[PDB]
């Protein structure tokens, strides 16, 4: 179970519970389009370990995102920290 937290305007985020079929970059954009139907979203950002905003425009970039996230979750479980969803910020 992967939870993707999709930032929305005005202090919200919509959490999407993704079940395990390959998650595609297109599928994420599709869900964002449902959640934000008045927006044009063709990409999204996430925050890396440096706090830098990283733009995702393809499946290969999305895979590097997911690997980072899973590594982070794994370390949190081991060290007994609260596990957070993968936060993304939709993007024109």
């Amino acid at each position: 179970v992967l939870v993707i937290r999709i930032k929305i305007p005005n202090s919200g985020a919509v959490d999407w519970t993704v079940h395990s079929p390959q998650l595609l970059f297109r599928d994420v954009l599709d869900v964002i389009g449902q959640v934000l139907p008045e927006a044009t979203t063709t990409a999204f950002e996430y925050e890396d370990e440096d706090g830098d905003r990283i733009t995702v425009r393809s499946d290969e970039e999305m895979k590097a995102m997911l690997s980072y996230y899973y590594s982070t979750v794994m370390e949190q479980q081991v060290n007994g920290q609260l596990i957070e969803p993968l936060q993304i910020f939709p993007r024109a």
Partner: protein
């Protein structure tokens, strides 16, 4: 020694792509061409210092810095037109 994460920076945007070890210069340059639409010079960045990676040796040395570092988890590479 898992995949090398390269954090490309180009025109106000950052992109992270993972490369299988051993990482080849030609493969990094080709990825830059397909992702950004044109060949671009690789500037390995650390704060106010940077170095042009011109070849396999240069890249290997950058990866060595990454691998010896207790801190760093990606190679920060600023992309500029030749």
């Amino acid at each position: 020694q898992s995949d090398v994460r390269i954090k490309f920076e180009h025109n106000g945007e950052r992109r992270i792509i993972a490369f299988s070890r051993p990482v080849k210069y030609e493969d990094v340059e080709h990825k830059v061409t397909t992702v950004f639409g044109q060949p671009l010079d690789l500037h390995y960045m650390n704060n106010e210092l940077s170095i042009l990676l011109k070849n396999q040796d240069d890249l290997d040395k950058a990866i060595d810095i990454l691998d010896r570092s207790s801190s760093m988890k990606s190679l920060r590479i600023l992309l500029l037109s030749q």
